[PDB]
Design a protein around this ligand. Structure first.
Ligand SMILES: C[N+](C)(C)CCO
Ligand SMILES: C[N+](C)(C)CCO
Ligand SMILES: C[N+](C)(C)CCO
Ligand SMILES: C[N+](C)(C)CCO
Ligand SMILES: C[N+](C)(C)CCO
Ligand SMILES: C[N+](C)(C)CCO
Ligand SMILES: C[N+](C)(C)CCO
Length: 298
């Protein structure tokens, strides 16, 4: 809704001048959208800018006061003629890098040789968060790595937290979200149906597995958890019943799986495990005899 002015080439910059004042920030001119920053220099290419449409950064000229309101910022793409790319779906564009953002008309820089697919929201900003395409989920970065906004809107690869104990996801080499059991850096992780990395005890397909409570990696062998011992086989699955480690027998509780100590009964017969879990065999324990199977013979 800006009219009556004209574009001007001056001082190796581009301005829009109306009645001898310069356009600043966002303007809708002649069916296209432009942005002229804080002093009037028309921008081109990739730009991380305050969002348009509020009025506070819109239809303003440099003779007018500017509200000190700090608006939210997003990525936008402008053509080399300054016109905003008004995309609401997706488009393959030169990759944004450290060398091709925040430039104004007149500044010399090369377009990126590498092109990437960028996704856009209904208001022409680069989209972030989860998107679905061709049978897969991809995550578009919401934040910079851990201030610089460059990563925002890029396709996440590898281990990625989704911030609103934020959930972990793993995206493969093309960005596809993995589900179910996956081996990453030599260790097993379970991502279920939703993609969220499991932690703690998890019942999957009729067996118990323990994933590290913080890191998600599947444990095997003997594990001391919640003041009790459990034995997990090499596949990760929790064992119940009798288990022989070398010559030594252990009994893992039916159901819960915790290792028994002291006197315990299995199918009518009595057994004694020392504090280590080791079954007493062919000896006595406090007056009671136990045979080669560890059974109490009265
Ligand atoms: C990965 N999903 C989009 C299915 C859920 C994340 O909120
Ligand atoms: C990235 N992991 C989820 C594997 C560990 C971080 O604590
Ligand atoms: C070995 N896991 C059971 C952890 C995954 C393969 O099914
Ligand atoms: C039964 N487990 C102890 C293995 C899981 C939590 O109930
Ligand atoms: C079963 N015993 C009698 C051997 C000991 C526990 O009461
Ligand atoms: C860990 N336990 C004490 C249960 C057995 C020794 O490996
Ligand atoms: C002989 N035990 C009772 C110790 C184990 C049989 O599975």
């Amino acid at each position: 809704n800006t009219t009556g002015g004209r574009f001007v080439d001056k001082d190796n910059r581009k301005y829009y001048v109306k009645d001898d004042h310069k356009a600043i920030y966002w303007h809708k001119i002649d069916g296209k959208t432009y942005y002229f920053g804080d002093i009037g220099e028309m921008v081109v290419g990739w730009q991380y800018l305050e969002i348009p449409g509020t009025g506070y950064r819109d239809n303003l000229f440099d003779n007018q006061p500017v509200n000190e309101i700090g608006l939210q910022e997003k990525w936008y793409y402008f053509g080399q003629d300054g016109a905003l790319l008004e995309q609401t779906d997706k488009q393959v564009l030169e990759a944004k890098t450290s060398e091709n953002t925040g430039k104004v008309y007149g500044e010399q820089y090369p377009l990126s040789a590498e092109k990437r697919t960028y996704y856009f929201d209904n208001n022409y900003a680069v989209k972030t968060g989860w998107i679905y395409e061709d049978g897969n989920w991809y995550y578009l970065n919401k934040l910079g790595n851990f201030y610089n906004p460059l990563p925002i809107g890029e396709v996440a690869k590898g281990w990625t937290q989704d911030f609103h104990p934020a959930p972990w996801y793993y995206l493969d080499a093309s960005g596809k979200m993995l589900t179910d059991w996956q081996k990453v850096n030599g260790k097993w992780y379970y991502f279920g149906s939703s993609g969220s990395m499991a932690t703690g005890w998890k019942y999957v397909r009729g067996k118990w597995y323990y994933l590290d409570n913080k890191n998600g990696d599947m444990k095997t062998g003997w594990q001391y958890l919640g003041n009790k011992w459990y034995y997990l086989r090499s596949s990760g699955a929790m064992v119940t019943g009798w288990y022989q480690d070398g010559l030594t027998w252990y009994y893992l509780n039916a159901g819960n799986g915790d290792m028994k100590t002291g006197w315990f009964q299995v199918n009518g017969k009595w057994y004694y495990a020392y504090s280590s879990g080791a079954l007493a065999v062919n000896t006595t324990v406090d007056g009671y005899s136990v045979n080669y199977n560890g059974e109490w013979v009265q």
